[PDB]
């Protein structure tokens, strides 16, 4: 019944049938993206229409298409041929991951470069790397991947320990042409292995860790209905899954007494980019839009009980499409559980004699994805006290290079001759806000320091100021940790019992934003990443901060073009876009496999409730 | 055998006997502080000498004394009479908490002020509040407390809901004189109660929370020997307890292969101050040094299994002195346990086919203290991967006032007529560093942005720079979140296998520091709080950032006077002092009892190890 239910295998099979019958899914076609469309605004009509958006690639060089289908009715709603030189190429296909290596293996220039290094072509892995937009005019309108080489000494070897530096190749994956092979010189291939399961490297495993048992004797406190609707400790929400964005949260609401109060209409990580800071021509083009170019949802891991998720776990297994329109289940792809979270509130009173302690807990919704060397955990947390938090966990294997004799200002040394270029991992959270409804506004809140003088004779006063953002043109904001800057999303038409507008406060981690020169290609293609906060007016087609087709797109698309409309955002249906990231100077401890590092943000109620919302929590 | 063992009841009884026999503990004397002294540097001699430092108050107006005693030998080592007008008053005594209320209850000016408000004196609680140093010349050299009044409607009522604004009194607690009563006008006493255990306010308690069971079937993975020596997952340390500082960590070291490698010699929270930002003369003097003036260790709570600490808990019960030199045990005052901490490292490799997941855990050492309205949890964490983290958890009841008709720039409204003045909670961590030994240096690390141009043609490069702090005069540093600023503590004489100095990186939360005007009394008395990082050369007598006697001390003492020595800190025995704090604009959700908010810092290895230190963690 719920329009927000996960896509079923039957729906995807129906999409396949509708596409094939319409002549849109011949043997030369590949589905590069398929996803359910959210209901339009004001869908108070039970007329449910389940619609799917499809990006269709053509392996013979014909123009790709964007297609919208209605599975409830069984029709193609629209089908548009795409001019990719104008609007961007389609996302990378899983089946193209091997094509770069196979095409280079018969190119005489590539073979000549390997022969000079005495490398057996059968042992050389080539990473399929998105190309970006740079100086090469022949790439405009062609589907290009770039390749960097790594040696595997044997089938189970970690190739990342053996980068082949000084060598890069560009390939046209549709015409099957190697356009350029660039060899800037021979670097020794680092020889130490990085096999973190080899006993010679781990030493004997510890025998000192005793088990920790986490169980729920009476089952979990949350309920799941309709496949993906969660109710937990006054929270209510729907857990969606999209092959591009991954886990998406819908209809986050809090049951306050008898009223179900909305907070967030849709929450997602709508883009993530990994720009590299090594100026070598072998790597200076590297900027991976893991979400927009590769689609993080399609590489979600199956999570193992007791290993990936510990405790009383409820799993969801989302269904996606393969390249031919067949449904594929990601078994155990989403973990959900509740966790104890320490002390919630505590006071021992010297006058009343009352001692009071309550414990906190949080609901966890998580998935893990793998994109080449990177592995990322995406965690959404809901706390008893109304707090909402997102946390990204970055691990995997660092992307490597040679370490140059004489050192580098842009590369860390990890092992003899082995380097790791500096880079960032930058995320964009898209928060379609609905604080007590859709009439919302954003205020910037700064601490205000006051001068000693009249009315402040002892020089102790301090205050704060709030600035309403009224138009999109003034809603591009930067962090200021020194002034304690935060942003409040409030509803000016909904007031608490003190007659103040209800609100939620966004707390950022205030990490550095995009470091690249503002004139660089990546600054233009990832403009969202240059500022910490953007606010737009809601529109159905403004989904991603980088636009719909990120791969090889020249720039400007997305948030800079949206905000040029300069729409009213003062008490309107608005969307907050928060940029946050990790700046990674790799350390020796990151090798040969990296311990998790984290970044995130949180939102806390700010006069949303009439008093603490956790007075009815029992004494444990 | 260990010199770092906790004080025993027998040692404190011996101190009492030594003091009394020497004529230093007559009926008019009170012990305001008693604590064990750490061993001096270079104590490679088994000649263990357990020494105690004592502050002795005199209730008859005679000069207080500072006394050092050796319990191993049974002598007074030194005894010095203190001129408190010069060097500061002694910490507040627990037995003075009631004296302010009792003295005011017979003062005609106080009674007149209560009568005008129709308040029964028997229902008026008076908080015993430290005085600071302001304009009142008669207070110099006198032991003063100030009092603010709150009404209790009945013995179990929360008085904090009923502040009596417009009224403050100053009392000399030795001469038992009320020096001043200031009445600036009648404010209505807020009438709503704040009784968070009253069913009429909580409503019916939730029945939806199912139990979470955390157990360790084979016991915990850590061992405790000699009372307070911990070994856990290659970590080694001693857990101390001091009545002023609370939990103190000694000799933090990590077992790397066959070598026990020191990291931190002594870690403590050496001061914490709560400055208030309300310019009303009723409250503009309020700055509570919860550590230096009140001593947070003496108010540590007894922690209850299943409520305060959940899981397989090992307790320590530290022993302190009462005011007469009798030993008193704080039963279950320190909790220690290990906790699962999610994913440690994870990678699924597209080329080797190997799937790898390991889980993290942390060791937790914690205590909770209560100072009037405030309750604070102090948490030290040790992680498998070498990370050390501190977290403060702030809860309790907010300090209240009236909310003025017409509003306030410096006070939040919590309930009809009830306000909460803006304030900060600022901590000072004192880290006596010992990275691979005592020859350490501090470097400031900033991200470096690079301009597009020659050698950076695509405008993508970024770098970092490190600045060594060579002398104390240049080692007073501020945060810069925008440049990703961190500080590295390294050992220039100890190198990793890449021939780089081993180090640890301090990551701050970059919260605002002291907001008061730099000319204010509190800026002078809490100078440490105006800057994020200080580095000093180690010295035995430089223990606290505010000096030994904080109460009513005029200012300048502590860190500003230490660094004036301008000592060499480049490869020397050094101490890092990190300031970090919460800026609290109270929200409605903080009332009537506040959900926990947190602040902290962490240190992570930076080329300390030759590769990841957690390759030998087993697969769970
Ligand atoms: Cu990284
Ligand atoms: Cu506070
Ligand atoms: Na274009
Ligand atoms: Na909205
Ligand atoms: Na003085
Ligand atoms: Na030191």
């Amino acid at each position: 019944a719920s329009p927000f239910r996960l896509a079923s295998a039957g729906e995807i099979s129906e999409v396949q049938g509708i596409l094939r019958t319409a002549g849109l899914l011949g043997p030369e076609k590949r589905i590069a993206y398929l996803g359910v469309l959210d209901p339009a605004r004001g869908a108070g009509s039970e007329a449910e229409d389940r619609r799917f958006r499809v990006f269709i690639h053509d392996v013979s060089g014909a123009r790709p298409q964007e297609v919208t289908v209605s599975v409830t009715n069984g029709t193609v709603i629209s089908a548009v041929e795409l001019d990719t030189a104008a609007t961007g190429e389609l996302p990378v296909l899983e089946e193209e991951f091997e094509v770069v290596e196979q095409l280079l293996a018969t190119d005489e220039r590539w073979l000549k470069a390997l022969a000079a290094r005495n490398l057996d072509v059968s042992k050389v892995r080539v990473a399929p790397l998105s190309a970006g937009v740079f100086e090469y005019a022949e790439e405009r309108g062609r589907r290009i991947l770039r390749g960097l080489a790594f040696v595997q000494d044997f089938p189970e070897d970690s190739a990342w320990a053996h980068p082949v530096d000084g060598l890069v190749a560009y390939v046209d994956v549709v015409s099957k042409e190697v356009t350029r092979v660039i060899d800037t010189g021979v670097f020794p291939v680092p020889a130490e292995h990085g096999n973190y399961t080899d006993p010679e490297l781990t030493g004997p495993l510890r025998t000192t860790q005793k088990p920790i048992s986490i169980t729920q004797p009476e089952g979990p406190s949350f309920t799941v209905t309709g496949g993906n609707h969660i109710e937990w400790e006054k929270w209510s929400l729907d857990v969606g899954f999209d092959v591009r964005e991954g886990v998406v949260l819908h209809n986050i609401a809090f049951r306050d007494g008898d009223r179900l109060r909305p907070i967030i209409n849709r929450a997602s990580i709508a883009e993530m980019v990994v720009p590299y800071g090594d100026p070598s021509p072998i790597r200076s083009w590297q900027n991976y839009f893991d979400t927009g170019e590769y689609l993080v949802g399609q590489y979600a891991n199956s999570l193992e009980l007791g290993c990936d998720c510990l405790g009383d776990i409820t799993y969801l297994s989302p269904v996606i499409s393969d390249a031919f329109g067949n449904p594929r289940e990601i078994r155990n792809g989403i973990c959900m559980h509740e966790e104890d979270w320490g002390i919630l509130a505590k006071h021992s009173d010297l006058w009343s004699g009352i001692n009071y302690t309550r414990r906190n807990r949080r609901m966890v919704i998580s998935f893990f994805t793998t994109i080449g060397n990177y592995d990322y955990g995406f965690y959404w947390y809901l706390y008893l006290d109304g707090t909402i938090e997102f946390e990204a966990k970055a691990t995997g294997v660092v992307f490597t290079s040679a370490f140059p004799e004489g050192g580098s200002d842009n590369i860390s040394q990890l092992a003899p001759g082995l380097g790791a270029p500096f880079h960032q991992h930058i995320f964009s959270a898209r928060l379609d806000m609905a604080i007590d409804g859709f009439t919302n506004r954003v205020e910037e809140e700064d601490v205000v320091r006051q001068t000693m003088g009249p009315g402040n004779e002892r020089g102790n006063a301090f205050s704060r100021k709030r600035t309403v953002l009224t138009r999109e043109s003034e809603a591009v904001r930067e962090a200021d940790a020194r002034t304690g800057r935060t942003w409040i999303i409030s509803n000016p038409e909904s007031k608490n019992r003190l007659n103040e507008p209800v609100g939620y406060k966004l707390h950022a981690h205030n990490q550095p934003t995009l470091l690249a020169d503002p004139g660089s290609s990546i600054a233009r293609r990832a403009a969202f990443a240059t500022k910490d906060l953007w606010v737009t007016r809601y529109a159905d087609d403004e989904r991603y901060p980088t636009g719909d087709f990120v791969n090889q797109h020249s720039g400007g698309a997305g948030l800079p073009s949206y905000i040029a409309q300069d729409r009213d955002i003062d008490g309107q249906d608005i969307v907050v876009w928060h940029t946050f990231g990790l700046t990674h100077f790799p350390r020796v401890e990151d090798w040969p496999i990296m311990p998790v590092d984290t970044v995130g943000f949180k939102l806390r109620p700010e006069g949303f409730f009439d008093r603490s919302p956790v007075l009815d929590v029992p004494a444990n």
Side-chain angles (χ1 to χ4, degrees), chain A residues 15 17-24 51-52 56 65-71 73-80:
Chain A
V15 175
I18 296 163
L19 290 181
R20 277 182 182 159
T21 298
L24 305 172
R51 306 192 165 148
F52 287 76
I56 301 172
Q65 300 189 41
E66 166 181 358
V67 176
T68 298
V69 174
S70 161
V71 297
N73 294 327
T75 49
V76 174
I77 290 169
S78 61
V80 181

Side-chain angles (χ1 to χ4, degrees), chain A residues 89-125:
Chain A
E89 303 290 334
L90 270 51
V92 182
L93 293 171
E94 182 176 15
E95 73 193 56
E96 298 169 322
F97 271 46
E98 61 181 36
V99 169
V100 184
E101 181 174 323
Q102 295 173 319
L103 283 172
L104 291 170
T106 58
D107 186 89
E108 309 162 1
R109 313 163 271 183
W110 186 253
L111 294 174
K112 195 151 309 181
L114 297 187
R117 300 160 162 84
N118 308 129
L119 300 181
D120 186 338
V121 67
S122 73
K123 300 190 178 20
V124 174
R125 302 287 81 77

Side-chain angles (χ1 to χ4, degrees), chain A residues 255-293:
Chain A
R255 304 190 176 271
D256 182 12
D258 71 64
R259 278 191 304 144
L260 184 60
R261 299 177 63 190
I263 296 164
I264 292 177
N265 186 65
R266 191 186 195 275
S268 71
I269 304 308
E271 186 58 85
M272 65 158 297
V273 65
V274 191
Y276 281 79
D278 180 357
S280 161
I282 304 307
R283 279 173 302 279
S284 59
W285 51 267
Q286 292 198 115
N287 304 279
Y288 304 120
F289 292 81
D290 287 335
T291 294
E293 286 168 336

Side-chain angles (χ1 to χ4, degrees), chain A residues 83-88 133 140 552-555:
Chain A
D83 185 338
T84 61
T87 47
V133 183
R140 291 316 294 148
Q552 290 179 263
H553 185 284
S554 62

Side-chain angles (χ1 to χ4, degrees), chain A residues 27 33 83 118 131 141 144 240 283 314 327 346 471 524 573 582 617:
Chain A
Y33 168 82
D83 185 338
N118 308 129
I144 303 278
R283 279 173 302 279
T314 297
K346 189 171 163 64
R471 305 194 78 58
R524 294 190 294 273
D573 189 352
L582 280 179
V617 169

Side-chain angles (χ1 to χ4, degrees), chain A residues 41 265 431-434 437-438 440 536 538 572-575:
Chain A
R41 281 294 201 267
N265 186 65
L431 314 163
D432 177 7
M433 297 303 299
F438 282 110
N440 295 168
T536 59
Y538 172 82
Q572 305 284 354
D573 189 352
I574 59 173
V575 181

Side-chain angles (χ1 to χ4, degrees), chain A residues 174 401 423 604:
Chain A
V174 179
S401 64
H423 58 281
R604 295 175 94 220

